Amino acid sequence: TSFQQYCDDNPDAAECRIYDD
Amino acid sequence: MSNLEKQIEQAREEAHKICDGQCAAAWDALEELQAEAAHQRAEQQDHKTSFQQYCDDNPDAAECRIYDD
Amino acid sequence: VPRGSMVRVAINGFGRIGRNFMRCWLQRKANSKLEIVGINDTSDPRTNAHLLKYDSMLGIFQDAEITADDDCIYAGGHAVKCVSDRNPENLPWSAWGIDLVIEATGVFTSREGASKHLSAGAKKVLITAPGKGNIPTYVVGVNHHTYDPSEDIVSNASCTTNCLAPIVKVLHEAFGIQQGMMTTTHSYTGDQRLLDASHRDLRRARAAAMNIVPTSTGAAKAVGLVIPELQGKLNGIALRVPTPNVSVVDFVAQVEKPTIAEQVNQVIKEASETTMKGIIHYSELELVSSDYRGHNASSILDASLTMVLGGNLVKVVAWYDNEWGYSQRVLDLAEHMAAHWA
Amino acid sequence: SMVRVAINGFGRIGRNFMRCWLQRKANSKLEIVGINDTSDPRTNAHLLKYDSMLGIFQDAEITADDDCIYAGGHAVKCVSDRNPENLPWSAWGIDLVIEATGVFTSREGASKHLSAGAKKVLITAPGKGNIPTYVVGVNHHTYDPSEDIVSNASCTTNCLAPIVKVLHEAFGIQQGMMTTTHSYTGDQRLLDASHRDLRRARAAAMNIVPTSTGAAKAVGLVIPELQGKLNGIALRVPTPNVSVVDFVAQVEKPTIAEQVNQVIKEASETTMKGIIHYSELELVSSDYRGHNASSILDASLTMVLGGNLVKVVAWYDNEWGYSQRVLDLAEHMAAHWA
Amino acid sequence: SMVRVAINGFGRIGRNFMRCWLQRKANSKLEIVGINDTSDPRTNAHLLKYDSMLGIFQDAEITADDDCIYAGGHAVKCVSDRNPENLPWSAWGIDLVIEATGVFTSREGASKHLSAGAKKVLITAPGKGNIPTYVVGVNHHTYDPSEDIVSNASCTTNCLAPIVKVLHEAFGIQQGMMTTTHSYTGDQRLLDASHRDLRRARAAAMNIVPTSTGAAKAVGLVIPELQGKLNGIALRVPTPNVSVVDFVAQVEKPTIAEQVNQVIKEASETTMKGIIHYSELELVSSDYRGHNASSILDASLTMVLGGNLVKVVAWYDNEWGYSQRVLDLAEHMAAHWA
Amino acid sequence: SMVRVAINGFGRIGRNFMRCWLQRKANSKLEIVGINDTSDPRTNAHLLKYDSMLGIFQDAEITADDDCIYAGGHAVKCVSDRNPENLPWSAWGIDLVIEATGVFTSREGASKHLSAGAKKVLITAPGKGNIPTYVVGVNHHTYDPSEDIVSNASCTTNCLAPIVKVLHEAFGIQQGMMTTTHSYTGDQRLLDASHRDLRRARAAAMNIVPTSTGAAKAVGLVIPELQGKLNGIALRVPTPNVSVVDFVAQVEKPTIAEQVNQVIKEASETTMKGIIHYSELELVSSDYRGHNASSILDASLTMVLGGNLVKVVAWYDNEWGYSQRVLDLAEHMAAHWA
Ligand SMILES: NC(=O)c1ccc[n+]([C@@H]2O[C@H](COP(=O)([O-])OP(=O)(O)OC[C@H]3O[C@@H](n4cnc5c(N)ncnc54)[C@H](O)[C@@H]3O)[C@@H](O)[C@H]2O)c1
Ligand SMILES: NC(=O)c1ccc[n+]([C@@H]2O[C@H](COP(=O)([O-])OP(=O)(O)OC[C@H]3O[C@@H](n4cnc5c(N)ncnc54)[C@H](O)[C@@H]3O)[C@@H](O)[C@H]2O)c1
Ligand SMILES: NC(=O)c1ccc[n+]([C@@H]2O[C@H](COP(=O)([O-])OP(=O)(O)OC[C@H]3O[C@@H](n4cnc5c(N)ncnc54)[C@H](O)[C@@H]3O)[C@@H](O)[C@H]2O)c1
Numbered sequence A: 001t002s003f004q005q006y007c008d009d010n011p012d013a014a015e016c017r018i019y020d021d
Numbered sequence B: 001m002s003n004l005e006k007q008i009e010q011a012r013e014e015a016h017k018i019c020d021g022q023c024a025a026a027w028d029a030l031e032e033l034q035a036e037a038a039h040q041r042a043e044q045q046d047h048k049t050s051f052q053q054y055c056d057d058n059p060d061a062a063e064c065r066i067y068d069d
Numbered sequence C: 001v002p003r004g005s006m007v008r009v010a011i012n013g014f015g016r017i018g019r020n021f022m023r024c025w026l027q028r029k030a031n032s033k034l035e036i037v038g039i040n041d042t043s044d045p046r047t048n049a050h051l052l053k054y055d056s057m058l059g060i061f062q063d064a065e066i067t068a069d070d071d072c073i074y075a076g077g078h079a080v081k082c083v084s085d086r087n088p089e090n091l092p093w094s095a096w097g098i099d100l101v102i103e104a105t106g107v108f109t110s111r112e113g114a115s116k117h118l119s120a121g122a123k124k125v126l127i128t129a130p131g132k133g134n135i136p137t138y139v140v141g142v143n144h145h146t147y148d149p150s151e152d153i154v155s156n157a158s159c160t161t162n163c164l165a166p167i168v169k170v171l172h173e174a175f176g177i178q179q180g181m182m183t184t185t186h187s188y189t190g191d192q193r194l195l196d197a198s199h200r201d202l203r204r205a206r207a208a209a210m211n212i213v214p215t216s217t218g219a220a221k222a223v224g225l226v227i228p229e230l231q232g233k234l235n236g237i238a239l240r241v242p243t244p245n246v247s248v249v250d251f252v253a254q255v256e257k258p259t260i261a262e263q264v265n266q267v268i269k270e271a272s273e274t275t276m277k278g279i280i281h282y283s284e285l286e287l288v289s290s291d292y293r294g295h296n297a298s299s300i301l302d303a304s305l306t307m308v309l310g311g312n313l314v315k316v317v318a319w320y321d322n323e324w325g326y327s328q329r330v331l332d333l334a335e336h337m338a339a340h341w342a
Numbered sequence D, E, F: 001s002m003v004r005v006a007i008n009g010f011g012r013i014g015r016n017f018m019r020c021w022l023q024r025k026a027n028s029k030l031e032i033v034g035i036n037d038t039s040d041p042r043t044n045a046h047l048l049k050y051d052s053m054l055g056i057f058q059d060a061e062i063t064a065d066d067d068c069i070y071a072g073g074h075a076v077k078c079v080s081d082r083n084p085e086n087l088p089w090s091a092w093g094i095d096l097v098i099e100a101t102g103v104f105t106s107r108e109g110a111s112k113h114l115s116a117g118a119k120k121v122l123i124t125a126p127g128k129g130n131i132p133t134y135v136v137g138v139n140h141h142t143y144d145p146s147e148d149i150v151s152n153a154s155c156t157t158n159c160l161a162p163i164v165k166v167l168h169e170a171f172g173i174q175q176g177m178m179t180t181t182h183s184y185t186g187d188q189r190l191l192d193a194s195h196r197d198l199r200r201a202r203a204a205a206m207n208i209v210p211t212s213t214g215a216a217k218a219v220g221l222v223i224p225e226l227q228g229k230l231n232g233i234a235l236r237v238p239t240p241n242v243s244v245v246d247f248v249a250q251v252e253k254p255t256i257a258e259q260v261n262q263v264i265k266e267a268s269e270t271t272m273k274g275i276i277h278y279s280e281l282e283l284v285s286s287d288y289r290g291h292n293a294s295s296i297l298d299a300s301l302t303m304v305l306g307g308n309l310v311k312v313v314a315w316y317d318n319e320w321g322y323s324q325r326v327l328d329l330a331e332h333m334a335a336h337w338a
């Protein structure tokens, strides 16, 4: 999707962070 | 009372096992641990804190509610 | 109470459970066998009518008007007489013809304490909590048909027991549960202090809305009361977290029949569509706690979280609305007692 | 020569006051020798040490037995009687009782400590009736040594009154409205449950809760010129500590925001030093945990319209900052004992 | 025929607006046909249905595929382009764009929709620059049908302005101070992290966070007589929705609290019906979740000092009540389409 | 000489690590000389000093200009570039980069530091692929000085693995299930908003939020005997810091709760001193803020059924505790620089 590529170009954006804790 | 509650439970099982004479002494031996368990809870009632007596008298107060969630 | 006549019900303790139960009955009053006619609480009718209508969790009550004077609360013109006495021996259960008392104060959970309603003139008592001593305990969907009308004092267990027992029953009949560990990540409840303050329990003493608070729980051992074959084979703890409602049970079981997470989900899904319909809901959605506000099921299995290791170590996760879901079961047990009143 | 102190009500204020005294113990004319509270001593030693707001107490070791709480060797006798007339104040030689239960703020309630053998009572709350009320830095020097029952007012009163006094002498306050966006307290309910106040009855950490504030009446007590000229409300919000007061005053001498901030800044460096702190930093409520000032003016929030309508905003730690002032008032009563 | 609508930005306001229109569609002149957003239609359908604040959506079925969101069989086309110049507004036949991203509030930014093919833009926020601002019930009937970009102001302005217009026409407002004790919004940070605003950088659910606001000054846009006579601040508190406005006004005509409440009550029953609600109930913030009014006056909190210093308190659901006004303004624009 | 350190990502872990090193600067082989972050030095100095969780930094003074942050007279050079290939690691003589952005967790992205001039990099998160993972106290002695990119695992793995290693070497862990009741972190949205994870999308401070986690399987990376024998999930709850691990293990050698506590207590006093803390106190989450141990066993919650099913519960400060281990691992690499 365009949403999935957005998180590829902005992995640090709020919609894209995954902290494995 | 982790040991006295477990021994009263086994002395009642031992009472039912022998009866199901020796059946009379098994019931008499059980009542001697129930008479001492009444002695242990009675002495605990003497040295109860004023806070603990407060929660007995006000079990619904904010300092005394215990909800088993 | 002749057949067709309502079982006259009084609520003792108009708190979270008492008011949740009242709003539950109000929405199901159409085909109910109960008539709520009395309330005893440490507060007054005008304060309690306000709290019944304006609920921070359930919202404003929409269905019927809620009014109060000095003596009664009116829920749609239906009058509920009110009284304020902490000693249930003094309560006017004889004068009001009370058949069933909903014991929701949290302090009269022993037989001696709950029997004080019987002394006052009530015929039966339903405790909205685990009973102390050998009080017959029931979980709807698990063993409520074992209820016998010759019992005057019963217990509907806790919210966690009502969530765990149906799951444990399904897993035990499918794979044979040998041991089981439970943790309930539970919303905070009224027994915790709002800020650090006096309490008999050093952990309930701590500020509830800014703390993860462990407490010991009997809810896991209580399953052995409704599933007697598993007595002494289950144990668990509780962790109160800063949410006001909705909780989640985490259960890890050592089972006999080797399996995988896929089969555990299918077996629970199958039971939720047959014997456990209305008690267990099977969900494959990625939801959070707020989405389960008002859910009527006792357990909502979060299927995405099921996992199995070595074929014998099973982990299942189930949601429950500890206020509304539990109160739906209190009403369900009360309706079942009414249908077999004798 | 030391003034022997007993704390009645070992709650938030009682335990904050205790930790305040332990840190300032080397210069004190007070000696805490007794505690009365619902809890036993062992429970209270645990609550005194482990605090969700103040953290674990680090200065001295805290232990207890059936009879006493021990704070670094120093023993504090403990009892649990909720009727103050039964309290062993004569047997303990108690001179000053810190009344912090919240339920003995009337003259007849606080006087029960006097019957038990205490000489003076300091109520950590607004009094009921004609009980002399004081705010340190505003009117505490008017304290008469013959008064046996006094009140340290409320936390919002101790924050607003020093700023009101400074603004009044500088510009002349004619009328004034207040609103304190206030952290919730133990008086509120964790979940919806019955309460005298139908709004404090509602889940504290889930709601903005409008309610009354003691500063609406008490500021006029410590600044008698302004009796009947100030009013306002409180907004209890889901924070466990630290609050902020919003004061909009109608003043006589027209001014601007820079001059208002200048007047308070100068006062914070001289007459109000240690009472008002002047801050131009962009902080939030957590940053003022443990602050010793009664008021911290957030200078960047000051604004004036038409010269006569002035808005000032001030922070305060309602638990710690107020308990510091309770200690200050108790130290002052010890210095002027008779 | 219908006015075809596209939503730019499917966030809190974009999704609340969608729910408002789904409930009010039976008597609507607008048809929501397209959505542009960061997310894919599947993620947005899930978030539209499951809402931590509004609960599960009840009125309509909501599903999605890779191309559309289906709100009751009605296919809503979805696209994910963050440059509005590229948006397919020409192909989709878009007439009106609900600009709810929060980043296209200038005319240069909002006009990117006009280049894409849209005919008008409604900014769900204050406009930057010379953009016509409207508050329904205050000045929306001054709407010029020839304007192509308009602003519905902010949620706080929508709460304060109707109360201000009633008080000014009744008593003559000379100056006015405001503080909105406000629920935190997505603009703040969950934990301490970088931000252009050093206060908004701080953990929102942990702090009372003061922040500046133009909502009080913005009232002068919709009530030109009061330009420059109002100012205010904002305090963000740990609640997720529902806020409250505290307004202290200096008025010309002396009055009392009973008359202030009676004037607002009468306006709420006549001219300001559906905009201002009058409540004498003792409620808290959670009780106003989903309220349709722009301002709910808390009548028992009204205070007046000296006749000319008036204090009023007004609730507002900053998400739902404002979204109802966004819908209201959009239907008004559709009724006057030119 | 001293190993020169650069911090990539001045977030919760980045700034916690900084404050950890500042308090241990006297006994350290590391010198923090550079920061790269999306924010400016003045904003980051403000956040470093004023921390909602840790409080106001008291040890040394913190200032900034356009180019540097100053901590205790020590200058820390700053830069703002999201692409690590552009960073001045060569010109600054950077030896070890602390990768704390959470974005460059693979050898591909982390090697860009090496291309820029850096010699080694320590990733403050689980790695993606061929990256050696280390948990201090479990396997950090197996570190090879020739490894250029390493991972310090997650905070949960650092809490669970020392407990697992102790239980495994005493009773033999066959299988094990984990659930971490976890404080919310920065990857969750404040209000319901777009996110590739539908549960992280939901309002963090309003929900219990389950998420998947590899922290339990990552224990197999550091205890290779247990590869594929451990699994678990996470439940994020509305607390800002401090978490707790619930571990249910299937065990070979039969045992009871008393012996399990004796073993872990024995380990915490000898082989695992400083890594595991054994606690018999009835504390809550707030009491473990700032605790330096990786795991604090709540001995009161230990329980065993049938001899083979063991449940142990351990606390951990996911921010401060993990940051202490990042420092410990970095100090270990400086001692084995080769
Ligand atoms: N809330 C839950 O999640 C939940 C779920 C299942 C079971 N329970 C159990 O149900 C019981 C009720 O819990 P709750 O959450 O409603 O607590 P609560 O404090 O909200 O309600 C208690 C109510 O009972 C009243 N009360 C107390 N003592 C009384 C007396 N002597 N006479 C008359 N009224 C009295 C109080 O005024 C209050 O209104 C508890 O034992 C709890 O363990 C609670
Ligand atoms: N917390 C604040 O922000 C704040 C600030 C200023 C003033 N105050 C005032 O200080 C007073 C104390 O408030 P708090 O927040 O500490 O309340 P709290 O509930 O935290 O403390 C009250 C303590 O007194 C005890 N207590 C109650 N009744 C008693 C009795 N009859 N005998 C003995 N002990 C009894 C309780 O067990 C509790 O430990 C209140 O009147 C409050 O209005 C509070
Ligand atoms: N929430 C409130 O309380 C409130 C009230 C009144 C007005 N407002 C205003 O309404 C506006 C919406 O705010 P919100 O609360 O919905 O914030 P939000 O973050 O919840 O909504 C923003 C949405 O827009 C999307 N978006 C951002 N940039 C985009 C782009 N270039 N292209 C397409 N989509 C994009 C984001 O993915 C997000 O879903 C804001 O300007 C705010 O000032 C908010």
Ligand SMILES: NC(=O)c1ccc[n+]([C@@H]2O[C@H](COP(=O)([O-])OP(=O)(O)OC[C@H]3O[C@@H](n4cnc5c(N)ncnc54)[C@H](O)[C@@H]3O)[C@@H](O)[C@H]2O)c1
Binding pocket: A012, A018, A019, A020, A021, E193, E194, F008, F009, F010, F011, F012, F013, F014, F036, F037, F038, F039, F081, F082, F083, F100, F101, F102, F103, F124, F125, F153, F154, F155, F156, F185, F186, F187, F318, F319, F322
């Ligand atoms: N916070 C915890 O509890 C915790 C514990 C253990 C491990 N971790 C891990 O540590 C990592 C850090 O997480 P956090 O909690 O500090 O999150 P955070 O958002 O607080 O920290 C991220 C910081 O990195 C910066 N950043 C992002 N992308 C960047 C880029 N391309 N270039 C430069 N700077 C950039 C951001 O500005 C932000 O300040 C995460 O991967 C997390 O999984 C977190």
